[PDB]
Amino acid sequence: RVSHEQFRAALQLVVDPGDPRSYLDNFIKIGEGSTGIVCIATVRSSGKLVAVKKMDLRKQQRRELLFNEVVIMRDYQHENVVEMYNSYLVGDELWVVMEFLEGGALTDIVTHTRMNEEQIAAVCLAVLQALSVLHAQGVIHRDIKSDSILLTHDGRVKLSDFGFCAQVSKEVPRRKSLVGTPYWMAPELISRLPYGPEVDIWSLGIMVIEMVDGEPPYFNEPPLKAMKMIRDNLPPRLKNLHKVSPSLKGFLDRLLVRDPAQRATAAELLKHPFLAKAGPPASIVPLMRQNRTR
């Protein structure tokens, strides 16, 4: 029996108090996640562009996850993680004022264009460098996908949408809770078992299929049957298994391991040769819609 009020009071302390509508003006909606809207605003004083994630407290499936965002954006800061400026509380909504990422989402790049290996390797590297820090401090970002990955004007990768991450300790080292995007889920999570931080390594594997094949495995299928197939059947494979290098296939084989105990860790993968192909963040800039002619 956690009242809507008792909850608000819990956030009232962890957030920046006051009304952010005081110093922000140019509110226009850019996109929409499962949690809420990512409406972008302009500052009055600086005159700079910032993203403002509004999320309703009442309209939530798992309400106590709202903490994840802000609680990870701070205490877990990094070059390949999004920067949060502030976080306020308004009416019945949670407003998180964040850095504006000019490059946009990865979803756009993979669907419309085909990335070469040197670009794909750069993205995987940046994510692992972010994960290796999170996993080491005991964090599981349980919703890894192209939709959660944002890019800068440089093309520098930034992991985002932390709402679906989880904390683990020596007391509670694993979790059962079912969280993430059906298609990018690891089997042990789909099966509703104790899952450690290796769920993200499978999910990163599914993103590599998304990066190559444009969409993830069994995507055209319904959501419930897609999971049954990932859980029951063999590790999913690429359609373009002929175009990929010997290195990439060998890399992805360590990501898409069904048995979590056998599936590679974050630290392990950083040493893998494939990530030597990783091209400069500037090599992603041409593939960004802004510069795409169509």
Question: In terms of CATH, what superfamily is 101-294?
Answer: Transferase(Phosphotransferase) domain 1 (1.10.510.10)
293 is in an annotated binding site: no
**What resolution in angstrom units was achieved for this structure?**
3.3
Q: What are the domain boundaries of the chain?
A: 1-100, 101-294
Residues 48, 67: contact at Cβ < 8 Å?
no
For residue 259, give both structure tokens: 């048995």
158 is in an annotated binding site: no
Q: Do domains 1-100 and 101-294 have the same CATH topology?
A: no
36 is in an annotated binding site: yes
Provide φ and ψ at 55, rounded to 5°: -135, 120
CA distances from 285 to 106, 187, 226 (A): 12, 35, 33
Domain 1-100 bears CATH identifier 1.10.4190.10: no
Active site residues: 143
Residues in the chain: 294
Q: How far apart are CA 145 and CA 205, in angstroms?
A: 10
Residues 128, 204: contact at Cβ < 8 Å?
yes
164 is in an annotated binding site: no
Q: How far apart are CA 203 and CA 255, in angstroms?
A: 8
Find where tokens 């094949």 sit: 213
